[model samples]
Target: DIEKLCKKAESEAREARSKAEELRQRHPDSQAARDAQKLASQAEEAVKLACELAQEHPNADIAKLCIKAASEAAEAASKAAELAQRHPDSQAARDAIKLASQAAEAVKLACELAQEHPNADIAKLCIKAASEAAEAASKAAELAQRHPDSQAARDAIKLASQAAEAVKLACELAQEHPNADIAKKCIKAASEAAEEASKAAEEAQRHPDSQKARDEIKEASQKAEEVKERCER
Candidate 1:
């Protein structure tokens, strides 16, 4: 029982990690993608614990699994830990988070079984599920990061802080820092200002000879920069 379960989980978890990794490459700032490392580590650790029992249990050749699968699991789980993207509300994003959640649940169950029964196919399944769930969440973040209005918002981000300060802030946001919830406020102030600024810029373009209107153009540009200073401060 332990053999089949552990074996199955080890493979599945490794696969999920692999998939999550590819997704990370595509969406560097994926909120979900970053979670894969810890989740995958959960699996590798889960399998290693299970295999340790096998190594000592005697029935399943002490060196057989520990030598290969357990070691591989460790390797697979430790390869990532970067910041990423994905929308939390969209359907695609929702499903990804769901999978990641389920995966974590399974890993928890696997942990419970590892402690209680110390044996079984079902416990191993939990390991498998956790790995998959974690990866699924990572994938979700990537998908969420690219919704219908995603690029438009980013385009606005440039105008938001004139892309200078915005670019700096946005880059900081991309790390695995896990402080995105708060950044929304900063983004909000700048974005609102950014939108207002653009309105005037577009307006200014329409009436070029408006040096009468020209002052408004300069004022708008000045205001946009001022808004950023206020937003950041």
Candidate 2:
């Protein structure tokens, strides 16, 4: 029991401690970062107590002393994560988005920590924020497609830059972009041309700089040309 929860607290505090340091450097005057400082220290204190008790008494006050630290650590982690979300700005939209996920991750940790002894609310709050931001970014791209010049499109891109991670920091452009159909068509033609080129090159290799090699090269280029201009699909 203590092991599972204390372990979680350890991780949550780790996240909060690091993120708080990040927020502190990012915005020294912010209260969230200030609070973040407390959360980590408190949890670190709890972990300290937990470890010492284990080293000596073995089973004496492990639950009594460290549970105090565990509870405090959860709340502190929550406070910092919430603050991290509000710290974002339009100028650093992508960074803000990345921050949101990081903080929200801490939020989920808080939720689990609290629900174990406190509230399901914080964790729920976290997942909701993550889910909401991702959609905002996705739909924004769809709107941008129809009216690329509109303010809605611009606003959405700002949101888009913030949420969603289908593939490690790459933008959600092609996954939902409209003109991928044209892009797909281009790929198909390229593949066909490549296959033709490979076959010709292979056959030509049997003859090198000789006359037969020249004929194979001609057939290859002509076949590649055929694939290029005829792909109306």
Candidate 3:
């Protein structure tokens, strides 16, 4: 029905409008806000057409089109929101958080769609991106924790984490980095990373995992030592 179409368009426009408003509020003097405003205007136009269409044809596919357009608009709005939120602060850290959050949302939405549209490649992509994003976020978090004092360390960790996540996704695509190897590497690397971080944290603050962390380091170190004995066998 045209009414349905109009409703969809209206809904999309509303969401777009809200996003634009958010962007404007968050970044009134930024380029992103300017762009968001443009998109918001376009969304309003679409909504107007939807309303007109609804009046002309109460039963039509306008709603579907509106939904699709709204989805796209929403995606763009999400990006704008992230950019606005990250600006005027720790841009790097905020970027990492934004990326991780986007990945998580993509996965969630894809999974929801996959239940109904089992053949959608988006679901697969979303899952892939989610895994990659999470891996990157974990690494980034680890690095940030590892070097709390140096901005360089913070940046490096963020980059490393992002790289690790990308590597994870690449590995999944090639199947060259199986779960076991990846997990083992991650577990080992992350454990060591944590140990290093804990030592640093302890110097600066109290860490709950310091003792357990020490034990883990000892166990891992001993395991590596025992590997030589096995090699001799």
Candidate 4:
């Protein structure tokens, strides 16, 4: 069953690449196009791995992995959309938005796959992760809208979203495997990073011209990276 799904995912990944190349050719000069292409490539890799795991563990709860992959792809798409909206003159923006739209479509497919599964544990975990990701995405959108030109603001939002993802994963691991010490450590690191990211965002909003505020955002992003590494491990 999972083999069939994996084959489908592989096909989707190939389609994504083809679309990405088309965008690149259509808008050779757009930074947004280049960025979107990168995101598409990443999504392709993520979906492949997600499918691989699902195939290997046919009877296991793999919805969490799918959701995680889907969320990341959606996040990338959202960022590309934001950039496209900000630069309407760039054809690359339009092209990038198309890629992002496709990424979102893929996420929906992953969500449907999760919903079709009969595993209650995975269903609950996916819901929780989705809820957290939605909240983070909302916050990121708000921050981006409020400070469209501020790199610190963007970094803060990205870091905050990543921290939220780490927390979600940690919670899932903790619930599934209570003896996972790394999960607990990841939770602590992610919580701390999220708090710091929030503080940095606020500071950036209040003092947009201050180097200190920007540096604080960088610091928070680094902290989030550490947590992300822990989660990966």
Residue pairs with backbone overlap in model 4: none
Candidate numbers, best lDDT first, in rank order: 4, 3, 1, 2
Q: Give the range of the ten consecutive residues with the poorest summed lDDT in model 4.
A: 129-138
Model 1, TM vs. native: 0.33
The Cα RMSD in angstroms, rounded to one decimal, for candidate 4 relative to the true structure is 8.7
**Local distance difference test scores for all models:** 0.40, 0.38, 0.40, 0.53
Off by over 4 Å in 2: 1-6, 61-72, 87-233
Instruction: Specify the poorest-scoring 10-residue window by lDDT in model 1.
Output: 76-85
Judged by lDDT against the true structure, how good is candidate 2?
0.38
Q: Which candidate do you rate higher for TM-score, 1 or 3?
A: 1
Give the clash count for each candidate. Answer: 17, 1, 10, 0
Per-residue CA lDDT of model 4 for 1-233, tens digit only, reads 55555555556556545655665677767665566566566656556556655654565656445635454554545555555546545544444344344334334433443545435344434434433343343344445556665665456556655655555555555445545566556656655655565566566666667687677667767876776666764
What local lDDT does model 3 show for residue 76?
Answer: 34
What stretches of model 3 exceed 4 Å from their correct place? 1-5, 62-233
Q: Positional deviation of 195 in candidate 1, in angstroms?
A: 50
TM-score of 2: 0.31
Worst 10 residues of 3 by lDDT: 224-233
Candidate 2 residue-pair clash tally? 1
